[PDB]
Each structure stands twice: as C-alpha cells, then as structure tokens.
Amino acid sequence: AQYREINAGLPTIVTFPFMFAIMFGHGFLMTLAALSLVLNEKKINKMKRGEIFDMAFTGRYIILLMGVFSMYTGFLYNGTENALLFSNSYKMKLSILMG
Amino acid sequence: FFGFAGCAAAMVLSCLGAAIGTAKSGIGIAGIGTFKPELIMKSLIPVVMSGILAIYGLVVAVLIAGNLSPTEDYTLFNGFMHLSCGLCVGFACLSSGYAIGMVGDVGVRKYMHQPRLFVGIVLILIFSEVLGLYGMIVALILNTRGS
Amino acid sequence: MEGVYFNIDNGFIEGVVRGYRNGLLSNNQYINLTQCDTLEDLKLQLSSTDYGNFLSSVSSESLTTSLIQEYASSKLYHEFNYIRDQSSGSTRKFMDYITYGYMIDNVALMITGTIHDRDKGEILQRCHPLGWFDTLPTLSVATDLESLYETVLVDTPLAPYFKNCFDTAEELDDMNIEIIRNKLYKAYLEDFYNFVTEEIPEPAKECMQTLLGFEADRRSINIALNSLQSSDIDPDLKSDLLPNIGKLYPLATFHLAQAQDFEGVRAALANVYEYRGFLETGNLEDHFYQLEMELCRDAFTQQFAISTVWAWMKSKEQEVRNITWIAECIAQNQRERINNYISVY
Amino acid sequence: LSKCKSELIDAFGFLGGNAFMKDKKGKINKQDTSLHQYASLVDTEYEPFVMYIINL
Amino acid sequence: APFFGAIGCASAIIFTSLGAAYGTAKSGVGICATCVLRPDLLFKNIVPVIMAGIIAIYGLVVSVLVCYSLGQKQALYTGFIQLGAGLSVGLSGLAAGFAIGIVGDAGVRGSSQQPRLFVGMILILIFAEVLGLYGLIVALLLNSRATQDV
Amino acid sequence: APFFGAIGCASAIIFTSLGAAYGTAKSGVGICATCVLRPDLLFKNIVPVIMAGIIAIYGLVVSVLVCYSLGQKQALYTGFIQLGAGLSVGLSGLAAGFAIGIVGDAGVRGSSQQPRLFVGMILILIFAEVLGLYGLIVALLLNSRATQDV
Amino acid sequence: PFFGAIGCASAIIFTSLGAAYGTAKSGVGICATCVLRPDLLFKNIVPVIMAGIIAIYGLVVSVLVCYSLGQKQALYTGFIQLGAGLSVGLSGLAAGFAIGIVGDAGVRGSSQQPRLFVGMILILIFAEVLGLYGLIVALLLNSRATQDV
Amino acid sequence: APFFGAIGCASAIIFTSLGAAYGTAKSGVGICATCVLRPDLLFKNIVPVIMAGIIAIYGLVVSVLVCYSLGQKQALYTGFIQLGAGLSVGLSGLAAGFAIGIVGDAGVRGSSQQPRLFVGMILILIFAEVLGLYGLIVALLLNSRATQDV
Amino acid sequence: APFFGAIGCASAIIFTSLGAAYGTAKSGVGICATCVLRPDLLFKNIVPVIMAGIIAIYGLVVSVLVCYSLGQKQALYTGFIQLGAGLSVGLSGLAAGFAIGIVGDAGVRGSSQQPRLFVGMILILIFAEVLGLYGLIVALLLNSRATQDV
Amino acid sequence: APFFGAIGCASAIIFTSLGAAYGTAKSGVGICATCVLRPDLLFKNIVPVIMAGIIAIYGLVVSVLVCYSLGQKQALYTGFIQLGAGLSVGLSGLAAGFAIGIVGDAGVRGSSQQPRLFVGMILILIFAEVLGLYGLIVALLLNSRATQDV
Amino acid sequence: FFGAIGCASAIIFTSLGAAYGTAKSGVGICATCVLRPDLLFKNIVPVIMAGIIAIYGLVVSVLVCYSLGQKQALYTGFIQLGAGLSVGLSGLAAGFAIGIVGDAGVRGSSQQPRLFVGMILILIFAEVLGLYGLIVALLLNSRATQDV
Amino acid sequence: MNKESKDDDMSLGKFSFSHFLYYLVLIVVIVYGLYKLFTGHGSDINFGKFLLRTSPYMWANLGIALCVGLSVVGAAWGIFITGSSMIGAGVRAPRITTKNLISIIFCEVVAIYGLIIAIVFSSKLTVATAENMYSKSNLYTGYSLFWAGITVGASNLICGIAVGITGATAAISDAADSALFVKILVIEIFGSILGLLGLIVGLLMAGKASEFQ
Amino acid sequence: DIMIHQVIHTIEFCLNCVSHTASYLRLWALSLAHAQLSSVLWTMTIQIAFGFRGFVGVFMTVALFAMWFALTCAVLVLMEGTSAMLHSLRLHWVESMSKPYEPFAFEYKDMEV
C-alpha cells in the first residue's frame, strides 16, 4: 500500500467515522475528551501515557471526527424514542436507506 | 396379571449374580503358572457356593409361580407382594453372588502370593456366602403367609 | 466391577499383548537363570522367551555386548512397535502415552545434551515406540520452546514434554535434565493416577492402583535417594515429593533425601517392603527393584483390562536389565551382584 | 522428665540470665539435627545453667 | 385399594445385603502378606466380615417382621404406614456397610503391615454398625402401629 | 386414607447414617493412615468417630418423634411434613458428616504429621454440628405441627 | 399440593451444605498449612467461623417460613415458600461454595506469606451478601404468602 | 390458580448468586495466589472481586421487583414473563460471573508477573458487565409488562 | 390463551450472554498471557474480547423487541414464532462465541509470537459476524411476523 | 393446534449456524496455530473458514422463506413439512459443517508440511459442502408445498 | 401400528453391525496387509463373511414390509418388532464378534499359515447365530396371517 | 395404544444408544433423561392424590421375539473375547489352546436356548398366542410370556456372557510356560449349567402361553 | 485463469451483496441498546434526584448524578470501544467492492500529509 494518490482508503475517512458514529447527547463527552486531545496532542505525542492513549493519540483525527459526528446521532436519539415498536419502524429502514 | 412380573423377576438377579461370581472366580483363577499345589485345591468353593444362588431363586420362582394362579383371589389389588418377594430374593442372590465374586477374585489370587492366607481367604469366603439366604427365607416366609 | 464393560479394543490388545506375554521369562526362568552358571543351562532357559528367538536363529553359548543390545532392541521394538502398530482407539492412544512418557526422558536428555555440546551418534530405546531418527532427531535438534511446542502439537496425542517445556520456558524448575527428569517423573506419576482415575468407571482396576502406588512410592524414594550426595538444591524441586499413598510427606522425603538422611518415611510407608530402615545404595537399589518387580505376576492373573498391560509394559525394563546383567555376567565368566540379591521377579 | 526439666529449668533459669531462659521439657531428637544436647560448637538449644539429657 | 406397601419388606434387605456385600468385597480386596508370612492378622481380619454381615443380619429381622405384618390382604391405610421402614434400615445398612468396607479395606491394608490399628479399626465398625440397629428400631416402631389395619 | 409421609421417618436416618458413615470412614482412613507412623495418636484420634457418630441420634429421635405423631387417619395437614422436616436434618447431617470426614482426614494426616492440630481439628469438627443442631431444631419445629390431622 | 415442606426445609440444607463444604475446605487448607508451621492455626480458623454464619439466615428463614404455615394444605401455599427457601438455599450454597475456595486459597496462601490475610478476609467478609440477598428475597416472597387456604 | 411464579424470582437470584459466587471464588483464588508472590498488586487485584460481586444486585433487585408484581392472588398467565426474564437474568448473571471469574483469575495471574496489562485486564474485565445490565434491563422491561394483567 | 411467549424472547439472552461470556473469557485468558511477551500487542489482542462480546446485542435487541410485544393478552398461535428466533439466535451466538473463544485464544497465542499474524487472526475472526447477523435477521423477521395487529 | 412450524425454522438456522460456527472455529484454530510456523501459508490456510462460513446461507434463506409464509395465524399442516424440511436442512448443514471442520483443521495442519495437498482439501471441502445443499434443496422442495394453506 | 421401526431396525442394526465389523476387519486387514502382500486374500475373508449378514435383515425387512399397507390390526403389529430386533441384535453381535474375530484371525494368519483355518472355521461357524435369528424372524413373519 | 409406539421407539432408541456406546464416538446417550424421568416421576407421583401405574393387558409381542432376540444377542457376544484370545495366542504354543473350542459350542448353545422356548411359546398362531383382553379374558398367560422370555433371555445372555468370559480366560490358561488349561476348563464347564437350569427353571416357572383358539 | 476468477468474483459479489445489507442492521441495535441503557439510568435517576427538596435534593442529586455520570461515561466508552463493527465490516466487506488495515492508517495519514 504505497500508492501516490489512489487507492489507499480515502473513503474510509468519511464512511468510517460517519457509519461508526451512528452506533452511539452521549457524543458531547466524546467531543470534549476528543477536543482535549487537540491541545494535548503536542505534549501527549511525546508523553506516551498509557496504552489506549497512544493509539487514541495516533488516531486523534478519527476520534475527533467520529467524536464530533457522534453528537448528532447521539443527541438525535435521546423522531423521538418513547417506547418499543414505534421508533424501530423508522430506525430499521433508516440504516438500510443510509447504507 | 401384574403379579407375573414379580415371579418372573425372581431368579433374574440370582442368575446374573451367580454368573458374575463364577465369571469373576474363573477370571481370577487364570494365574499364575502353577496349578499342582493350590489351584484348584480350595479355590473351587466360590463357584459351587455361588452356583446355588440361581437354584434358590429358581426354586423360589417355581414356588411363587405355582402359588400364583388365575383362579384364586386376584381381585384386590393385592398382587404387589410377588414383586417384593422376587425382587427381595433377586437382590439378595445378586448381592451374594456379587460379593462372592469379589471375595473369590481376591481370595483366588491371594493364595499364590502367601500360603498362610489360604485359611483366612477360605474363612472369609465361607462366611460371605450366607448373604443369599435372607432373600430365600424372606421369599418363602412371604409366600407362606399369603396366596 | 465386572460384567459391565464390553470394550473390544482392550480385549484385542489384551490378547495380542497376552500372546507375547505368554511366551516370556517368568519368575522360575529368572530364578533358574540367576542360579545357573552354564552356557547350555543359561541359553536353554533364556532361549524359550521372546528375546531367545535371536538366540534360536543365531546359536551362541556366550552372550556378547552387541548381541544383547541388538536382541534387546529387537525385542523391545518388536514388543512395543508391534503391539502399538496393531492397536487402535483409546487403548492404542492411551498406550502410546506410556511409550511417549518413557521416550520423553531420553528426548529431554538429548535435547539438553544438544545444547550442552555433547556427542551423539547412537541412542538406545527402552520403551519408546518411535525411533531415534524420525521423532527424536527433530525434537533433539530443536532448542526453542515454540519449535518444541509446534513439533509436539503435530503428534497425536500430545506427549508429556509439552508441560516440561512450558514449565522450563519460564525457568521455574531447573536448567538441566536432573530437575526436569524429577519434575517429569512427578508429572508422569500424577498422569498415571489421572488416567487410572479417569478409566476407573469403564474398566475395573485393582492391581494397577497398588502397583502404581508402590511404584510411585518406590520411584519417589529412588528419586530422593538418587539426589542424595549429588548436591541437590533444597529450594528447587528435585526429590519428587508428592502425595500418592498417604503416609509419605514432602518434608520427610525432601528433608531426609537432601541433607538429613532420615529413613523414617520408608518404615512409615510400609513394613513389607525390602528396605524400610536401610541406608545403603546397594541394598536400596536391589530393594527398589524387588519392590518394583512385585505386583507384576499377580496383576497378570486378571484379564480384560489395561492394568495388566501397564505392569507388563513396565516389567520389560527390569527384565531387560536382569537378562542383560545375567547374560553379560554369565557370559563374561563372573558372578552377579544385583541379580543375585534380588529374588522377587 | 518434662516436669522435672521444666521445673528445674524454670527454677534454675534465673541464675544465668532473664534473656537466655526459655520454657522447655523433655528431650526431642531428630535425624536431621540432634537437639537438646547442649552443644558448644554447633547450633543447638542453650540454657542459663548446665543441663544434659540422658535417656537410657 | 391398590395394596401398596409390600415392596417395603423386600426393599429392606436389599440395601443391607448390598452394603454387607460391599463391605466384605471391599474388605477382602488388597494384599495381606509382607514377604512370606503375616503377623497372624488373618484371625483379626475375620471380624470385618462378621461386622459387615451384622448389618444384614439385623436388617433381616425388619424384613421378617414386615413380611409377617404384611399378610395376604391389607388396606391402603395400614399398607401406606407399613411401607417406609425398610428403606431407613437399608440406607443406614448400606452407608454403614460402605464405611465398614472402606474402614475394613484401609484397616486391612494397614493392618497387614502392623496390627496396631486393629484397636481403632475394630471400634470403628462397631461404632458404625449402629445405623442398622437404629433403622431396625425405627422400622419396628413404624411397623408397631401398622398391625390390625381396617 | 391416602398418605405419603411414611418415608420421612427413614429419610432422615438414611442421609444421617450415610453422612455419619462417610465421616466415620473418612476419619477411620486418616486414623488408619496416621496410626502407622505414630501409634500414640490412635486413641486420641478415635474420639472423632464417636463425636461424628452422634449426628444419627437427631435423625433417629426425629424419626421416632415423627412416627410417634401418626394417628389412625391421614389428612392433608400431616403428609409431606416429615419428609421435609426429616429431610432437612438428613441433609444437614449429611453435609456435616461430609465436611466432618474431609476435616477429619486432613486433621488426622496433618495431626499425624505435626502436633497441636487436634485442638483445631477437634474445634472445627465440634463446631460443624451447628448445622445438624439447627436442622434438628427446624425438624422439631416442623414435626411439632405434624399432628391434628383434620 | 402440600409439598412446600421440602422447599422450606431445603433452605437450611443448602446453607448447611455450603457451610459444611466451606468448613471442609478451610479445614483442608488449615491442615495443609499447619504442617509447615504450627504458629498460625488460630488465624486460619476465621474462615470456618465466617463460613458457618451463613446457616443462620437459612435457619431463621426456615423457622420464619415454618411459623407462617397454616392448618390447611393447598396449591397457593406450596409454591412461594419453595422458591423463597430454594433461593436462600442456593444463595447460601453458592456463598459457601465461594467461601470454601476463598478460605482454602487464603489458608493455603497464608502459610508462605501472612500478608494476604487482609485481602482474603476482605473478600471472604465481602462474599456474605448472597445469603442476605437470598434471605431478603425469601422474606419478600414469604411476605406475600399470607391468607393460605 | 397454580401460583408457581416464584420460580422465576428464585432462579434469577440463584443464577446470579451462583455466578457471583463462582466469580468471587475464581477472583479470590487468583488474588490469594498472586498476593503471596507480590504484595504490591494487593490493592490492584481487589477490583475483580468487587466487580464480580456486583452481579448479585441485579438478580436481587430483579427478584425484589418481581416479588412485588406477583400479587396476593396469582393467576395462570401471570408466571410467564417473570420466569423468562428471571431465567434470562439468571443465565446472563451466571455467564457474566463465569466470564468475570476467568477474566479475574487470568487478569490477576497475568498481572502478577508484569503490571503493564492492568489497563487491558481492567478494560476486558469491565467490558463483561454489559450482559448483566442487558439481562437486568430485559427483566425490568418484562417486569413492567407483568403488572397490567389482572 | 396462556400467554407464555416470554420464554422465546428470554431464551436468546441466556445463550447469547453465555457465548459472549465464554468468548470474552477465552480471549481474556490468552490476552493476559500474550500481553506479557509484548506490551504493544495488548491493544491489538484486546479486539477479540469486544468482538466476542459484541454478539450479545442481537439477543438483547431481540429480547428487548420481543419483550414489548407481549403485553397482557395473547393468542394461541402467538409465542411459537419467537421461540425459533430466540433459540436460533441463542444457539448461533453461543456456538459463534464458543468458536470465537478458542479461535481468539489460539489467534492471540499465535499472534503473540509473530505480529504479522494479527491481520490474519483479525481477518479470520471478522467473518464470524455473518452467523449472528443472519440469526438476528431471522429472529427479527420472525419477531416482526408475530405481531400483525396493533 | 397452536403452532409447530417455528421449531424447524429455528432448528434449521440454529443447526446451520452451529455447524458453520464449529467448522469456522475448528478451521480458525488450526489456521491460527499453523499460521505462526509459515507466513506464506496464511492466505492458503484461510480458505477453510471462509468456505465453511458460507453454509449458513442455506439455513438462513430456508428460515427466511419458511418465516415469510408464516404470519399471525396459521394452520397445523405447515408445522410438519416445515419442521421436516427445517430439520433436514439443519441436519444437512450441521453434518456439512461438522464434516467440513475436521477436514479443514486436518488440511490446514497438514498443509504446512507438504504444500501439495491443497487441491485435495479444497476438493474435499467443495465435495463435502454439497451435503448441506442437498438438504437445502429438499427443504426448498418441502417448503414449496407449505405455502398452499395459509 | 408401529411395525415400521421394527422392520427398519433389522436393516439398521444389521447395517450398523456389518458396518462396524467391516470397519474393524478392514482396519485390521489393512494394517496386517502392509507387512506381507500375500496375506491380503486370506485376510479379506472376514469382511466378506461379515458383510453377508445384511441379506437376512433385508429379506426379513422385505417380508415384514410386504405385510404392511394392505392389511393391519392391533395384534398384527407386534411380531415385526421382535423379528427385526432378533435379526438386528444377532447381526450386530455377529458383526461385532466377526470384526474382532476377523482381526485376530488376520493376525494369526499373518503370523503363520496355521490359525487361518481355525479363524476361517470360527468365522464360517459364526453364521449360525444370524441364521437362527433369521429362521426365527421368518417363522414369526410366516404366521402373521391368522384372521383378516 | 401409545404404549406400543412409545415402547417400540424407546426400545429402539435404547438399543441404538446402547449399541453406539461401545462403538466409535458418533452418538451419545442422554444423561439428562434419567434425572428428567426421575424428577417427572417423583413430581407427578406425589401430586396429586393418586397412584401412578400403567395398565396393559398382554401386548402379545415381546415374549417370543424378546426371548430369542435376547438369547441370540447374548450368545453372539461371548465368542468375541474367546476367539480373539485363541487366535491371539498365535505360534507361541501347539498346546490345548487350539483344542479348547468346545466352549464355543457351549456359547453357541445359548442361541438355541430361549429360541426353542420361543418356538414352543407359539402354537397355531403368530399374532396372539392365547386369550387376550380385547375379545376374551384370561390375559395373564399372554402377559407372563414377556417376563418369562425376558428372564430366560437375560439368564441365557448372562450365562453366555459368563461362558464367554470363562472361555476367554480358558483360551491361554497360563501366564508362564508349562501350564495346563484343564483347570480353567473345569471352572468354565460349571458355568454352562446356568443356561440349561435357568432355561428349564425359567420356562417351567413361567407356565405356557400357547394353544390359543 | 479468468474462469475461476469469474465464478469466485460472482459468488463473492453475490455473498457480499446480501452480506452488506445483512450486516448493516447493527446500527439501530447498538443505538437502541446504548440509548436504553443510558435513558434507563437517567430516567430512573432524575426523578429520584429531583425529589426531597432542600439539602437532601442537593446531596442526593449530586451523589446520584455523580454515580450516574460515572457509570454513563464508562458505558459510553464501552460502546465507543465496542463500535469497531463498522471498521471491521468496512475493512472486510467494503474493501472488496471499492478496490486490510491499510485504510485505517491511510485515513490518519491522509490528514497529516
């Protein structure tokens, strides 16, 4: 995988975080913790604190885009959710229409 | 007609117990290279002792079969005593043959190792054969007290 | 119990092992062979056994060094590869672990000897059903735990060297064949109790428990006496201490074996053994062979069980050393010392 | 010998010192190490006064 | 009535005879000689067979009393109260016969080398044999109220 | 009349005799194994079999008390009470005998190895009878309401 | 019906069996640890007394369930007490089964190092909530069994 | 009516108590075995017993909530949702405790040698708690639909 | 009607939670052993625990969807279609979790020595979601056809 | 009758998912274990898991086709041919997965030593995969007659 | 009317016993045939002798199947179960004994040309147990027409 | 009735798992069926107030086929351990191990034993051997033939199993050289009388169930 | 060589065509599970936190909101860690029709360069 312009997975940066963000406002805490990694990218890039913080700091752009996109689908869920057998009729066809 | 299974199941446990005891004694009398001195000198007592367990349950099954008839009092229902008599004699004959086979299996092999234990193994094997008499005595006492 | 198992696989291997066990050297042939000092009387009694077929083909009166090794190797290979090649199922798969456990001791000493920078151009097989050029050279040539686990994983079933390689991978038992041989002897002693406890339901075993307990106590006392005067480490496991009977403690065996010299475990274990208060290695060596030789002819009386084949497979090790020592001593014009002291066969 | 050894050791233990006296009774020997011998060259038990255990 | 209760008399000596057979079977197994002879413990090892057979001998009286109290015809009231005494003597005779079998096997194997354990091994089977007497006493007390049924 | 509570009298003595036989066998195995090394602790170790054998008296007294509370008529207020009341003391005596056997074997082997273990093994074995005492108290409380069959 | 006596009686049998297995494993671990050094036998006896306290919940639940029994026997009074007694019995058997392995592991590990007595006493003291939960569930199920016909 | 709805409330606390007992035993075995060789991981290894012991509150709260919804007069169709939700919560708590026990023992044994796997053992041990929350939420959703009938 | 259809919805979460718990325990058992050889391979080996535990969402969503469809009243033909989807999704998730446990342990042990096999181990374990997705789709299609009115 | 069709439709996808999960686990175990010794054989050894995982489409399509004909109310004639075709498709998929698993593990293990038997293992898996297709065709032929009523 | 499982149990038990006896005789014949190739024809007799037991269960299953579907009653559906069970158990025991007897006869004939006549005599004499069950099944199946 | 189709499927399913138990591992017996039948029998036995019991009359089937099938199935399994040992000896000795084939005839007598009683247990009929409780009375003669043929079949199977076990040890008869096989044959000859005495005592104790008009 | 490649590509396209739409249905299940697991604790915590006014509402509302948000952040981190099914399905199934772990490294390396 050493291509110059294509293909290297350019559609995964948009399809990856948008489809991954639909599984989750619960996205506000991920947007705040992902927003702390922007300022903490410089000292955190040379600190190497923890094992998940290293891979999270390497994929900081994917966690920032997926964390920012998670606030929309997270705040949209909790039309409206009141009981079962009502939101599933639209949420069922919503994933097929989006996919 | 439920009393026929109790009479038919009389010697079914005594035949398997005596067959397992004779098979255990014959399987335990294979060794060990010498047959002139001790085997079979006093080792044949377990097969002949366990052989009468099938004859006791056969005699009890013949007495219970001859005592039970279709023209006697058979509308009670009171024919459940034949299952207790035949199962009582069958469990005693099967336990006596099973204990006689396990005692003869170690008593037959124990004679070749030490010759001083031949009186002890025959002394325990002679006393171990008295277990089967309780089922025949209880079956004859139960069959004598009823029809 | 008896009359409840109908395993035809144990009946076929019991009859095939009984056919070779019928024409073998009994206690009368060993007692008459030990007292005999003539070439015709020694060759006549030993000629009627399974090892006497090579003496019947090649007639001789004086036992040679290469003839005893060739006849013992052909007798062990014919008695092990022939019965192992004709068996199948759980009887052959369980019977292969007995040969793999005996070959694992020579395979561990060859694997440690390969890293030890020692010469090797000929290796004898005692009870190993596999040759020293197909399975022994691949495991002996490899020195990594990944290659030994990958080579041990290809065999079916797994051998006992995988647990010794897994324990020796972290450096928790020893860096020689002594501590790995003692831990492999303890794990091999526990594997016989695990297999005897697992096969206790289907097959009836009574002589295998007494022979495994007496052979485990004599193997633990012999392993504890072998580490005496050899600079045995008290912290590392080298005496083979473990509960197998109920009257042997690990502090009494390891403490009396390492530097204490306390024979109270021998008298406390039993009073009918050959050595219970002795302290000499010569009398304890013949007493361990006389105690290990017991429970072999009495276990051969019962049939239709693997307990007779378990003691019958272990009797060939003492029978090969007694036949080689009696044939080498009688052929070499000398008197037997260890064979003359032993009377229990 | 345990009662006379504990009573004699407890009665005569104050003569040598209060830091080297301990309660003991009888004589327990072992195969790995003979204890209760009052050895002055090897490691063993010690008391404030001279005490020897002889078992016939 | 169904005439249920006759199986209790025949089921009494089943567990007692199986316990005594397991006692003599477990006591007869094992080696008892050391080299050529023994300590004369063969006369001491005969007590476990009589101790295992004592549970069946005590259990036979409960089956004899239940068989004598059964009769030819009986109602469900006396038959229901009569059944149950044999299982109590049978279970205690089987458990005491199993404990006397393991105690006779360990006391016989350890008693072959040294006969010093016969003092505790002889009192262990005597202290374990009381289950058949208690089950026979409970079977006699249960069978004492089952006579003269209507 | 119809009755099914006759097995409750032998159900307590069956499990109590089985647990006391298993605990007596487990204590006799460790006493026989420890009697070979030291023959002095045999008489001191023989007390745990008699101490473990006292659990059968609760099932025998509960079986005699349950059998003594049986009248001439069978109702729906007496049946099925002695099975659970005797079964609770039987299960408690079986668990107490099962723990008393494993505690007696390790207490006999560990006490034979090193001294001073008879106080701890006798303390745990003497303290293991609380489940049988509570099961006997619950069996007496459940057996106290087994009469007055309407 | 009339079969709730086995369910009401099995609650003390489950906790008695779990406490018996815990006392058996604690006696096995104390017997195995007392061979190397007979100086911590009194410290290792805490597991049998801690495991034996679970029988009081099933005994008090069995006595309280037995005290609430009426004079008649129907199908409404032999279903709630069986699950209520079986819940406290299974909870006491599971708590005794965990207290046996915890007391055996603490008694076995306490021989080489006695520093784990705080953690083993903390886990063994913390594993007794199952008997109180099953006793509270048996009391809650027993509270709705009134008015038995 | 039968009034047999208590089996669903008892099976949830039985399965949750068995899974929490097996998880607490499996975590205490590896914690007690790892505490001897390394006293620094004593405070770190205590997280598995506290995380495994929290599964009992879901089955206890589900049984306490299901006990109030049973009613003084039971029906025939009432004991279905409580039995299914109680069996699902019991199996989910037993599987969560069984996975938490092996995860706690493997986490303590692997964390005893090197302390670098504490984050992976903490995340893998904390990730298995969703089964008891999903089964408790399903038992609460099924318990909410068991109070409208009757 | 009896309205006993809660067993079909509750049957899925037991097998799904048991399979996900066994797969998470099998991956967590080898993850702590594989994390000791390499500290960077802990986060790569931690994916099989979440991949094995991710199969519980199908049974939890099927049980949560089938839980609200019960209500109070039911029909004679309602309660049998959800049992096939719940048992099929439960057995498929349990078998996929059981194979994912040994496949995750063998993939973590094989990937612990060589880091190049992590892509093959993740690619081999990535294809196991089709069985749980097909069983969850069949359980969703079966649960969707059970309720047709209201 | 109420309904009997969902047992075959659930057992078909349950047996196909169980056989495909067992074959995928057995192929992934030997592929993950044999992938460490040979890195070039990782792409060749991964054919058995992907080929074994495609067997669930027959039971999934048969369960979807059988589920599409069953609504809210149904008769009893479909619940025997549907259960027979679902049981035949489930047994064919389970036999195909169980037969494919051992050949995939033995082929993946034997492929490391001599890389010439890959065509024999691929032809053995391709020839063993038709057993589920025959049962899927019999389940389709039996499922074609289950849509006439209802 | 449940005589179909009794009629199929003869061919099922005879096919299972003949399959196990042919599997063990083929395993022992294939294992002993690797040493000497001349003993293949002598060792091949046990599989052919064991495989001939299926004709009795097939003929008894055809004769029992011929009396089903045209006439049947409550008393005319019991003889097929014992007739099929007799030939099935006799064929299964004859195949199971013929497997180990064929393996021991193949090893004895492979050792020397002495025990091959004894193993061939025992294998030829072991067919009387299946012939007795086939004659009992034909005798019980022959009297299946009394009334109606 | 359901007892015919239930006892036939249970009898076929018991011999299927029982025959597949000693065979290669392809199927296993249901271990939960004993606890499920014990819990279901003990639960329905106590509640409610009633006495559980099955009530057939004769069932007409299992006696003649069960006697000959049980005797032939037991007699056919005894020669396996004897023929494997007699041929398992090989060229080790020309002794009585090749002349002791008289025990194979004694094991072969167990096939005729019980089959002759099954041949004598049916006179001029094959559906019903005597009067049944469908159009007549006295069904105890047809009822006792099942227990008589089952007892004679189990006794002949146990005597043939004991004769085969005695013949397998009587094949070699010696662990060492210079041994005699007459001592094992003397004890093996004593086990052959259990089939004849058990068949005569079992057939005489069961009466007769033939001659039904 | 195009004969086996055409049938393998047709069978792979036919399997991935139903595999994509069959695998795309996890979004509503995960969102409904996390939303139900968060809304259950939030709806079962807000009402108990809002009652008992005074200091009990501040202490009980703070202690309930702290333990609620503490488990809610761990549940959201558990769902975010468990949300790799879109990366696995997009890496496995999405990589076949478009053209391994090259797209995940290429997505982070795309924004850097």
Numbering used by the authors:
A (entry chain b): 400 to 423, 427 to 480, 524 to 544
B (entry chain S): 17 to 163
C (entry chain Q): 1 to 345
D (entry chain O): 337 to 392
E (entry chain T), F (entry chain U), H (entry chain W), I (entry chain X), J (entry chain Y): 9 to 158
G (entry chain V): 10 to 158
K (entry chain a): 11 to 158
L (entry chain R): 1 to 213
Task: Show sentences the authors wrote.
In order to understand how SidK interacts with the V-ATPase, purified full length SidK (residues 1 to 573) and detergent solubilized and purified intact V-ATPase from S. cerevisiae were incubated together and the resulting complex analysed by cryo-EM. In the absence of ATP, V-ATPase adopts three distinct conformations that correspond to different rotational positions of its rotor subcomplex relative to the rest of the enzyme. While V-ATPase particles decorated with SidK were found in all three rotational states of the enzyme, the highest-quality cryo-EM map was obtained for V-ATPase in rotational state 1 fully decorated with three copies of SidK and reached a resolution of 6.8 Å. A pseudo atomic model of the V-ATPase:SidK3 assembly was constructed using the cryo-EM map to guide flexible fitting of the crystal structure of SidK determined here, an earlier model of V-ATPase subunits A3B3CDE3FG3, and a model of the VO region subunits ac8c′c″def. Fitting of SidK into each of the three corresponding densities in the map required flexing the crystal structure only at the interface between α-helical bundles I and II. The fitting shows that SidK binds the V-ATPase A-subunit primarily via its first α-helical bundle (blue bracket) and the three copies of SidK each interact mostly with the corresponding N-terminal region of one of the three A-subunits. Although the SidK crystal structure spans almost the entire region that binds the V-ATPase, it is missing the first 16 residues of the protein, which the cryo-EM map shows to form a hook-like feature that penetrates the non-catalytic interfaces between AB heterodimers ('hook'). The C-terminal region of SidK is poorly resolved in the map and has lower density than SidK-N, suggesting flexible tethering between the N- and C-terminal regions (grey density).
